[PDB]
Design a protein around this ligand. Structure first.
Ligand SMILES: Nc1ncnc2c1ncn2[C@@H]1O[C@H](COP(=O)(O)OP(=O)(O)O)[C@@H](O)[C@H]1O
Ligand SMILES: Nc1ncnc2c1ncn2[C@@H]1O[C@H](COP(=O)(O)OP(=O)(O)O)[C@@H](O)[C@H]1O
Ligand SMILES: Nc1ncnc2c1ncn2[C@@H]1O[C@H](COP(=O)(O)OP(=O)(O)O)[C@@H](O)[C@H]1O
Ligand SMILES: Nc1ncnc2c1ncn2[C@@H]1O[C@H](COP(=O)(O)OP(=O)(O)O)[C@@H](O)[C@H]1O
Ligand SMILES: [Mg+2]
Ligand SMILES: [Mg+2]
Ligand SMILES: [Mg+2]
Ligand SMILES: [Mg+2]
Lengths: 374, 374, 373, 373
């Protein structure tokens, strides 16, 4: 109880996590997808809706078109986002937002107008008493109970990096890279055509994504793994499509995740995630690098490939001096790391003074977000 | 016990020595540095201070800025000095100064206002029952148990000279030189850039200082030492930085301490320390010079370079007549020579009458320091 | 050099063959294999059991037409060996033992398609050398250009690929299923609303010939349907082989419109005007200017009247108004791929990239995917 | 005169070359070496494997730009020999066998940087003589002065050095890391807050051109941000090569401000107005009066509008109010170093300090650090 009962929402990109503050796990998880009917629509007395949002669209995806409003972190369809927020407040959580402060998350290095429009909708359409916006990668350090370390948060829209030393951030050592899990699915679709399988419908992008989540893995070494797959056939697995017609996957199993370390497979000029996180460490001060090397933290859904922790260690020690020690912390839960940190933050007694009240918004306007109250 | 238990404090410049009177060694040694946070400061519930003073600033020097209150000996930041004195009385010594007379040190040829402000702070903010101020180089003769001799006290702020003959000082033969250990570190930073190493951050000045304290040494002869280093590579040592990336030092090893004997490397017009101490001897009376030549005393931290005692002897006998004998006394301990003399002085039964009492300060004011009670 | 290299363009539904260094292909004939359907009374006739090529078109009234290539990928390997034998001994009248050959292949195809083609040529026909090239790359050789974006639409598949100063961008290549074969099927379906039925596979040729002579692309679709709804000045007559002339109304300009609106059949992909715009925006920022002014058209299905003006109108509606957009349409389009192949197989610098018999024996059929494509 | 000495200014990001005794450099081109990135289809093109100079700028859409020099020090010695070959045979069209050359070097640089430059010129190119001079010393020759303090800020490093009546003070020389290259990177970061992304190394040239045309220095920073917050009269438009014009607001005057407030990136050093004040106070007491009234500006990165008035305002806030302070800004600033080099290499008294081939053979590469600098 306590009559405060703050709310936590993690918009993300492609997955929505919602729940109450002070719990252990989110109470509602569902994709952020809005669908529209495509075909003629014969017969009568059915009483069927004109748009489906959430898990309902996944069930009926065979006749309707999937569309994603949020992309690369920035929201592009504001009319669709108000539909998703209405679904996770009245239909799933079954709560009235009039007496419930909410907490939201935002990726680093985003357009300023993205934050301002979110504040207008919550404070006017939903009439929340208070609200807040926090960086996703900062909350990931609250979950682990740490104060020092470098966090690599890779999700579906964008992966970013930020170092923190004893509760102080370094804004000039923050790196952002577009490569994410959405671009990995598209690459898998392209290289699957070389075996004879065609997946072009937007409703068939979910079929390819499910294959990636179950079969793909990261190889420790790329040159000699392609040699073993070229001769023997012990690296093949079978997948059953919904209508049947089972398929076989060969060396494409470990080729799609490799794009993270070699982003030249799509055509980008940036370096891999192992070199991006090394440049951030070398951008900080000299005497704080030692504690940053031994406190590498992994978070995000796209980081749960098997063998990704061992591959990252091998590449990092090849660049760093051989004297020091390097370790990577990978908690058993990674997808909900951001939400857990948000629940912890919204329960401290010292945090109850940094809420953005309704009175402040009326006097100052939507520009109050960029002030000392972030 | 004895319920008197006088206190001894040596402010210095860059190092603070504190302890009780009648002991063998100081009980508290820590740098005189005050630091301020530099970066944004994300996170909550940390409860972190706004300023760190002493050994705490050295540990966290990677995010904060180091600042020194005393320069060339005189105090420039009076607000910061009250912070250091509070740290060495309640936090480190763990004592109440209300029932503890204190003894302080001061360099020769200093502004008059420097002494007056020190008396005001101790007698009003801390409410000491008594206090005293003594010259640093006079106390260095108490430690050695001598009465005659010339003392060259070189520290971090300023080096000075003063001759004493059988308990009588000669104020007109006192020489003060600007060069000290702080200017030696800056010269090492400049000549290190010719090999490819850059050290510009104020927190990186501690890295360069530690190299000087471990590798540098004084060469007996400068012309032929540069010839051996030019051909062979047997004069090089390696240093490991905190993050790794070991470095190599060549002929810069013996070039930085040479500035003491040749102050033209920075641009000063004054003579070296070997000629400054010779002019002081020739400024005294004719028949007392014989005892001054054979009683040369070395004190201070910056005088603990290897080979500095033999180099000083070689240059001095080149100027003095060849008939007489010249020797230099270098005790195994040199950094604590001033503190040891202060402890001895504050324990004699005949010294208990020259304390500056609270009653005298109230009646006369801060100008009582310049009277017969120094 | 006395090489006299050979050039062959398999395509899908039309075969172009000839010698290297000439101006036009020497043999053009459909790729169709037919089988008798009826009883077969009478004696002393001495009639064959299968007809391939132009022979099947003449006798299509008693036999069934079958296509071995669908959307580009070969599905009947036994029938393809029959077609290749026809274009080497019966039409070209040549012995392939002393004649290097050049073949074409569409982008984004199964890997096994290339490997099986190499096995047949190097073993059944015993060619001394062979090569495989992309169809849309050869279309730029014919025009004598080095920069530009090529939209090659044929009978099986239309594809797009940008090239800038002799460098390709493999990540900006788009492939679309829609082609000329799906346009004929749509015409058959909408012809039933007037009373005409065309269901036999030998009657698909009747509908195709109507499309090649009457259909055209309209500049605007909304107001063209208004003029056809009121007046009857947009109707033409076609005479069937046995007579019974027919009339075509607004179906004349409705079948080609499927290219710009692929929702008429049920596909979710965008039209050819939006597919080629996405490819341009997928490249680098400073090379887009030269790509806008060097749009090249090739392929048989691109020879609809008014298709060049319609493409220009839609493209400038999306691109910024500052720059200029033009489309290059050579007077010959069906033979653009073959002409580029003849030019490539004659340069002195190309004589080193042939896949020799010695290399195939040592390495095997996997040599195609190596540096020698 | 058969001597015809050569002058070369390597710099960092721009190369100035020409003959001695002229008015302006004859060849100016960026110091960039590019490598192809993509597949490279097509044949008969005959295209090179690396482009250096202005050629790489034209074709930057398919290749990667790389800079050999960084912060004054040369990091890629294999690439530098390619640039020097380009400015001697391809652009200047001269044979260096009978042409003494003059080179420039920044203060407080690694000793090995000077030695390697002497080896390449005296062995690979076989010059009869050569010399190396400090960049900021040559800037005083152009103005025809003898006393003054020179602040030379370029693309790699800004440095300061006071000179009084032909005598230098080596102990009052300050070197700062901040330069024009770090200003471009800051502009890229703060441009993302409006929605524009510039991440490709070929897109760093787009951002640099915006800085050279729109950015300016504001006299006061606190009240300028107030006017830009309310009105929209401080916005200008820029047209990208493909179109899609953009708008710049208060970022117009925020990027150059980093010079006076280097805490925007994270550096702890003071601004250029306080660095030049500390150098003056490091000299002797009676020579400061002539140094205050002879402040000289040189370098490309000093040609921001309003930079001369802003520097004056901050300097007089620290110096005593009795004396007068002025800043000399010649109409030409980018070529100030080259002009001084041409003047020096023409005096009759300078013809004795050349480093001859005979001296190098007898002494070796260490002759550079001797009395003949
Ligand atoms: N077990 C797994 N293996 C590989 N990838 C996964 C796995 N589980 C999820 N993913 C990928 O992670 C993405 C989800 O990331 P998520 O944590 O939801 O980020 P966000 O909250 O920003 O959407 C999906 O696109 C999916 O492709
Ligand atoms: N072993 C050593 N060799 C050379 N220099 C030293 C050594 N130890 C200390 N120093 C120098 O001496 C200085 C400390 O002098 P110190 O005795 O503390 O004088 P003060 O008490 O006036 O600060 C330091 O700056 C350091 O550079
Ligand atoms: N004049 C024309 N107008 C419209 N369509 C045509 C015309 N001529 C040919 N076509 C179409 O083009 C197709 C032939 O394309 P073609 O160039 O042979 O491609 P491929 O070589 O891949 O078979 C035929 O199916 C036909 O429908
Ligand atoms: N008009 C201008 N306004 C602002 N900056 C400029 C202008 N012209 C040139 N610059 C900057 O000056 C730099 C060139 O400096 P330059 O004189 O070439 O030094 P160097 O010779 O050491 O390369 C470029 O990086 C550019 O950003
Ligand atoms: Mg996330
Ligand atoms: Mg001392
Ligand atoms: Mg074709
Ligand atoms: Mg320059």
């Amino acid at each position: 109880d306590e009559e405060t009962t703050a709310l936590v929402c993690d918009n993300g990109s492609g997955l929505v996590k919602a729940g109450f503050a002070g719990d252990d796990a989110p109470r509602a998880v569902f994709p952020s997808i809005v669908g529209r009917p495509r075909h003629q629509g014969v017969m009568v007395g059915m009483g069927q809706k004109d748009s489906y949002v959430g898990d309902e669209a996944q069930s009926k995806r065979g006749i309707l078109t999937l569309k994603y409003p949020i992309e690369h972190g920035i929201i592009t369809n504001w009319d669709d986002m108000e539909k998703i927020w209405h679904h996770t407040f009245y239909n799933e959580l079954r709560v009235a937002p009039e007496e419930h402060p909410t907490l939201l998350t935002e990726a680093p290095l985003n357009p300023k107008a993205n934050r301002e429009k979110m504040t207008q909708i919550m404070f006017e359409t939903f009439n929340v008493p208070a609200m807040y916006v926090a960086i996703q990668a900062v909350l990931s350090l609250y979950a682990s109970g740490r104060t020092t370390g470098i966090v690599l948060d890779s999700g579906d829209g964008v992966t970013h990096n930020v170092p923190i030393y004893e509760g102080y951030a370094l804004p000039h050592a923050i790196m952002r890279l577009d490569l994410a899990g959405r671009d990995l699915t598209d690459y898998l679709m392209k290289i699957l055509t070389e075996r004879g399988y065609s997946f072009v419908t937007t409703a068939e992008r979910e079929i390819v994504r499910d294959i990636k989540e179950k079969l793909c893995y990261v190889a420790l070494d790329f040159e000699n793994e392609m040699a073993t797959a070229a001769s023997s056939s012990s690296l093949e697995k079978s997948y059953e499509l919904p209508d049947g017609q089972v398929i076989t996957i060969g060396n494409e199993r470990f080729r799609c995740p490799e794009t993270l370390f070699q982003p030249s497979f799509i055509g980008m000029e940036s370096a891999g995630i192992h070199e991006t996180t090394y440049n951030s460490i070398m951008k900080c001060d000299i005497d704080i690098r030692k504690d940053l090397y031994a406190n590498n933290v992994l978070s995000g859904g796209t980081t749960m490939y098997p063998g990704i922790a061992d591959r990252m260690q091998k590449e990092i020690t090849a660049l760093a001096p051989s004297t020091m020690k390097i370790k990577i912390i990978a908690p058993p839960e990674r997808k909900y790391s951001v939400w857990i940190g948000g629940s912890i933050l919204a329960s401290l007694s010292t945090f109850q003074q940094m809420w953005i009240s309704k009175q402040e918004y009326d006097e100052a306007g939507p520009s109050i977000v960029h002030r000392k109250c972030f």
